[PDB]
Amino acid sequence: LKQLLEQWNLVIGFLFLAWIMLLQFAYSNRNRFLYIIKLVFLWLLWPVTLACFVLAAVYRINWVTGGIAIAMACIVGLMWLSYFVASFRLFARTRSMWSFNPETNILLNVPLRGTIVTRPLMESELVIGAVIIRGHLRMAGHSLGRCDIKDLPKEITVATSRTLSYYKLGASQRVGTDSGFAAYNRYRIGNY
Amino acid sequence: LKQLLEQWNLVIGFLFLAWIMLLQFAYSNRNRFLYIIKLVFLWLLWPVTLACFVLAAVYRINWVTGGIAIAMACIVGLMWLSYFVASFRLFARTRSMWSFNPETNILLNVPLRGTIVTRPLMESELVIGAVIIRGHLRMAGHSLGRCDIKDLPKEITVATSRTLSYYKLGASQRVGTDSGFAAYNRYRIGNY
């Protein structure tokens, strides 16, 4: 029984180090692979926090610590239930992977290159801006891949799980060689 | 007693919980008082990560674990050592406390209401968009306070430790009476 059992310090050390790397050599949604990994770390954080409080409850020094550790664990796992319900409801309205994510319950859908590109959205305002840099399209903080200005979509949609909003392309401009700028305005609102 | 390590479980329980709260309630900047706090936390992940690896190099289980803990601590040291070098050099050009943030090395300066508003900018590109919602200005993810479209600045600047860029107001439009939209195009580049 007289063991150190302190190897968890290496486990937590590496976990913190992973967070530093994600926020330093990635952070920005430059590609889908890094973004997906970041979303996983933002998910696993839930059971890790929960476990920390549970251990305090199990090896509690006294009943005061026990009661507190249990109450704290009850909150962290009370929120996870929420993360789920909201994600499930979004999924039920749509039919895509992106419906399950810790950041937001609103999706942006932009038709490109013969198909539709979907990303999580943290906005849903009257006006959505778009910027084209060296032939690449960037919207709402996400890279949507290659798209020239002359072929920029005239319609995009946003799904909030309660309502469906349709946006229409307004004025657009070219700003040097293959760069430019555009904006979308809500034109219609439908309900689910 | 066994070092009453249950206390360390409580500390990490609370520290992790802080990130769960910040990333759910203090997202997308918005309130300057939440943003300025979030920036504090990230500045205390280099000493926490380091302490975890350093402590493990004292309470060693074996030589292999010790060697790894030391190597990892060394790497975490080199991270904090860059943040300090980069921040001081930026400060030398732009004498503002915003130069000491643990996110980026670029500052955005937008003149408003008789003064100049400064915020961290994630990247410097040819075109910077601006959105006005119900009389409030949002640029590069930051809220810069109240600004009507008719009062929108004709020039903004972006400063780094090496160069200085000036952006000229280009196109603008009113959308929905109170809301509106504009874009800024880089027109001049300077050095230092």
């Epitope: 038709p111 539709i116 009257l126 609102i189 | 009476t177």
Partner: antibody, heavy 113, light 112 residues
């Protein structure tokens, strides 16, 4: 640039059914919604329904429900409206529209013996 | 089942004079403080075209002579420098609710 070519006029008896075939071109077939209008005798615009050619997910109002079926054929870049149990009040100029901008030329439907 | 009506049945307007068409809604819309209302134009033998969207956003390709405004339940279409080519039927659409509805249509005639 963008076209919405109609199949042309047709005449049927009461109780008959038909399919209105709209052929488009100039853009990728999917990615934009489709809307139908009736414009009945006289000068009155009306909304029949909306569909998403990418995956279905149709939506109708409560008055035209059961009177029409809206479908799509991705292989020919077309969209169809199936007219059910046509009566004397169904004679009209039917046509497709995309985003309140582009319209078809009009398919004249006459219901009469 | 949201009813919209226009006040005039038709207008008789001389060249160079302002023409106006008004419309009222049974509902205030009020979505995040924004009202919705589209205005359309139709000529004989042709499908309609959109002129104005969301109460005030002029459609591209439409001349500035067409100025839309209003708020709440009161919507107005103002055509100031009326010309000889402005001879068409104008319509309203709410563009806010699942049972989308249109107005009755107002006919513009030009005096000569």
């Amino acid at each position: 640039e963008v076209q919405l070519q109609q199949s042309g006029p047709e005449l049927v008896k009461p109780g008959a059914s038909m399919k209105i075939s709209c052929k488009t071109s100039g853009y990728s077939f999917t990615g934009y919604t489709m809307n139908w209008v009736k414009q009945s005798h006289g000068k009155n615009l009306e909304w029949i329904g909306l569909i998403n050619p990418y995956n279905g997910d149709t939506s109708y109002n409560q008055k035209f429900k059961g009177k029409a079926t809206l479908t799509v054929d991705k292989s020919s870049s077309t969209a169809y409206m199936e007219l059910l149990s046509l009566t004397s009040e169904d004679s009209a100029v039917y046509y497709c529209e995309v985003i309140n901008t582009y319209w078809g030329q009009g398919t004249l439907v006459t219901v009469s013996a | 089942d949201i009813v919209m009506t226009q006040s005039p049945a038709s207008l008789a307007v001389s060249l160079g004079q302002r023409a106006t068409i008004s419309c009222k809604a049974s509902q205030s819309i009020d979505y995040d403080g924004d009202n919705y209302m589209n205005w359309y134009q139709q000529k004989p033998g042709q499908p309609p075209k959109l002129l104005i969207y969301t109460t005030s956003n002029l459609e591209s390709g439409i001349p500035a002579r067409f100025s839309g405004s209003g708020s709440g339940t009161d919507f107005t279409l103002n055509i100031h420098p009326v010309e000889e080519g402005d001879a068409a039927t104008y319509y309203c659409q709410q563009n806010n609710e699942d049972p989308y509805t249109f107005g009755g249509g107002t006919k513009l005639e030009i005096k000569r």
